[PDB]
Design a protein around this ligand. Sequence first.
Ligand SMILES: [Mn+2]
Ligand SMILES: [Mn+2]
Ligand SMILES: [Mn+2]
Ligand SMILES: [Mn+2]
Ligand SMILES: [Mn+2]
Ligand SMILES: [Mn+2]
Ligand SMILES: [Mn+2]
Ligand SMILES: [Mn+2]
Ligand SMILES: [Mn+2]
Ligand SMILES: [Mn+2]
Ligand SMILES: [Mn+2]
Ligand SMILES: [Mn+2]
Ligand SMILES: [Mn+2]
Ligand SMILES: [Mn+2]
Lengths: 258, 258, 260, 258
Amino acid sequence: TVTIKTPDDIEKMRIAGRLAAEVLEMIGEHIKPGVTTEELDRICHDYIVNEQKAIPAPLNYKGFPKSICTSINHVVCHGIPNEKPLKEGDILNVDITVIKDGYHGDTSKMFLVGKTPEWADRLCQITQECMYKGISVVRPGAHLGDIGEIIQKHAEKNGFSVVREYCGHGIGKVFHEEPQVLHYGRAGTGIELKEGMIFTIEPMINQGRPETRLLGDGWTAITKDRKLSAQWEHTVLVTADGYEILTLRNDETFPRTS
Amino acid sequence: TVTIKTPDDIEKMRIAGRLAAEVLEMIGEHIKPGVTTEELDRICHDYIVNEQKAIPAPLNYKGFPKSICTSINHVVCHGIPNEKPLKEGDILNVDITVIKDGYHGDTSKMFLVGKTPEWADRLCQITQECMYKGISVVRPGAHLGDIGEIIQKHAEKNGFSVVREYCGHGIGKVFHEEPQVLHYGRAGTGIELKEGMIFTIEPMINQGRPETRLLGDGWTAITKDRKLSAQWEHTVLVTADGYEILTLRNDETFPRTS
Amino acid sequence: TVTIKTPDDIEKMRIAGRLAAEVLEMIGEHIKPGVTTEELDRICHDYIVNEQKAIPAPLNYKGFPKSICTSINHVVCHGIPNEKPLKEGDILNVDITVIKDGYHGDTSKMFLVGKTPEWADRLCQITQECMYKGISVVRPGAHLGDIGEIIQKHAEKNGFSVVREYCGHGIGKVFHEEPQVLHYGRAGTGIELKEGMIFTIEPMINQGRPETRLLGDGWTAITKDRKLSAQWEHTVLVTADGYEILTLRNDETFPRTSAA
Amino acid sequence: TVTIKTPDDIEKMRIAGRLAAEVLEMIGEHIKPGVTTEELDRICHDYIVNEQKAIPAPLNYKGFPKSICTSINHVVCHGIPNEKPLKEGDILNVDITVIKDGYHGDTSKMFLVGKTPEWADRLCQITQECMYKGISVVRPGAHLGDIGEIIQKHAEKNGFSVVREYCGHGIGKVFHEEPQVLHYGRAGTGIELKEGMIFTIEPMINQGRPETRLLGDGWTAITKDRKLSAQWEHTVLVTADGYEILTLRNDETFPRTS
Ligand SMILES: [Mn+2]
Ligand SMILES: [Mn+2]
Ligand SMILES: [Mn+2]
Ligand SMILES: [Mn+2]
Ligand SMILES: [Mn+2]
Ligand SMILES: [Mn+2]
Ligand SMILES: [Mn+2]
Ligand SMILES: [Mn+2]
Ligand SMILES: [Mn+2]
Ligand SMILES: [Mn+2]
Ligand SMILES: [Mn+2]
Ligand SMILES: [Mn+2]
Ligand SMILES: [Mn+2]
Ligand SMILES: [Mn+2]
């Protein structure tokens, strides 16, 4: 079965989700042509440990060797920071998880590096709209299948496709727990939602076809046709009559609660 | 089916809605202990016909004998103006409808008469909160059961009950048209909302049990237990992204559109 | 404000269910030691045809020979009225269905004949409590499996067993239609309930073991172990927020609706 | 205002009254288990038209379809003759009205079918005693309330009740005229009686509670509790010295006149 959180559990989860949003607000100033992805990893690690008094959750998790994930261009997810510099025309995803006194918060966003193609800015805008529509249907008595149907309809109207081989997850005292959150599907299918459940919504959307391929290093996933791919993520709580977003930033204009 | 209004129809419904709101702003200055409900009906009739250049919709409609409805304490709806004085401690509903060049606007509010008891004040507060929550869920793709469920949950968790045999309604070039609007129910059920539809939200909430009965005159309804009952009403348009309230007053702080 | 409206088919099903409940209210005054089950059939038939201006649905249905069903002691369901008298200590089920201008109403209850023993009284009481728990979970968005789970848990923690090979049914302008309503199972399984659906809740519960067998007339079912069995039945409507009982009597204290 | 009959109208009322009593004397030998109420209707019709040279007043009167009324067990009044046989143990009322050259006579009695239970025999006897006590108070100077008080007191001492919704009537050249004759009330109330008035006394008495219910055919009335009901009827003239009974049978022992 899925876990139900207490009123005291809910207060410690609000503190961890605010600190994860603050790392994304700090890192923006440092993104330009010429800076390396291993330079960005060192800056985020020192801020989390020395200034917030917390720990980066990816470090040593099932053998992962760094503190954050960094994914550029045709890469879908799980990219490893290294010594290559950022170039004029690149699109970039930064993905963060923090632990504070045993509790987890999980979130990601897109950056545009100088002059980009018009196709590329539009792919990134339509991906963010898809995540906001999926959050809008969450409440007691809805089903998990209602999330997948609304995301899949908005992507296909714009000529793009939905990745099937990766998904969202429950979260709390551990990094990954039940249920599996699919980003495609039919309304009315899957488990019924209840007050006190906590889970992520994290859609991956491709320019061409849906299939992926894994690289040599055992971690890095790319598109099979070599076209572009975009992602955004938030942590979400089910309340008495709707939703609350735990990881909301100062620069966003969508409302925190229903 | 359900009628869909044109751009010219909408402009004329905005003029009728503003006039009905001004009748309520005007009469609040005349209400205090000692005044009769028949004197209040005379003041409202003269304002509508001689200053606005319009007509009162209740007058002679299926035999009804007056131009407004006035309901006190244990009365639920449809009270007839008469020769009795208002008293220190009473609670009062005034319900208005105006016709201007063929088009209808409909709205009602609660007034406190001199010094009132704390348990009467709490009932009037919770009922106005119920109405505003039902308005906040309206947009294209929502369903009518969404309105019923959010109203019923807010009343019952605070210890109050919902009136079952009276409802809200469609409105335009006629007073009463399709659909029926219930104040109780389950989310995602009933017909689906579209741009250009117009209807009323008007909940009746009780201090004690939900049952009602009709008196000897054929018109006045009361609570079967003789405890208190309260009501508030607005006229509402579905827009391209949300709602617009056509009967909003300058004394209110809640926003006009989404 | 304006008064709510009600579709014509629902007004006609409310009339048929009030008539079937009135048949059970009338017949209780005639039940006592020495009266035969064929004499109860003749009294019921005359009331429905001459006073109500209606018809008995069991008569001639797939060949059945009488107007009502009468089921005694170790008999489980579908017994035929005959020339044998009732005796002191007996338990009795009387099962009724009425048709009024094409529309159907379906209901049954238990009667205690003279002084009865303590172990018979306890079985009849727990069977009534099972039926009422099953009606309590009905609303838009519940599943057919939630009805079977709550009935099966209440019977088994009190020491009794559930009959598996007979079920409740859909009803309206016809006697028997989809869905099948099982009295055992697991919560969240089977079809979802919707506003406007109409069906029966009718559990059979046994003193000992659950297995049954059919006698040679092709109709009468009995317990395999020869110990006692009991049943109660109502017709139920799904409303916009919960349930309505169409066949309620003036003698019951459970509420007609959710509201209450 | 009540009509007063002349000496010539009085001699013609005596002839019609003796004929209606002769119908009741004839029919008694045909009543036993297994005969139908429509067979009894045919025998009465033929005797009145072919042997008396007269007409049955109920036939086609305001829609009524038969020549006599036949009421059994829990039925109170107005039963329609039909194809159902009489059963051993029943109680039965036969009600007759004849017209002879324009003048009306009206009377009824109770019959026991085969062997009967002893406390049904008792209800039929106490009902006959009630009728005879009301005839006994009639003379010039009495009041109509004296009739109702004496009837009600006898029935309630014996544990029975009086039907309120049906009553006795004026009679003459028309079937139903003024005054209304109630079978409950207080001594010394209502109109004062005068020589030359003619009216009926016809009490209905129940085993349990007094309330009644109407069947679907629109004519047949029953007890609300389903217990037994009985009735007896005579036509009565006010004379100079006291009373005269116009419908007396050859088998009765009560005195014809004062
Ligand atoms: Mn995640
Ligand atoms: Mn993540
Ligand atoms: Mn479901
Ligand atoms: Mn990418
Ligand atoms: Mn009130
Ligand atoms: Mn109104
Ligand atoms: Mn929909
Ligand atoms: Mn209205
Ligand atoms: Mn049945
Ligand atoms: Mn059945
Ligand atoms: Mn049995
Ligand atoms: Mn008569
Ligand atoms: Mn008469
Ligand atoms: Mn009778």
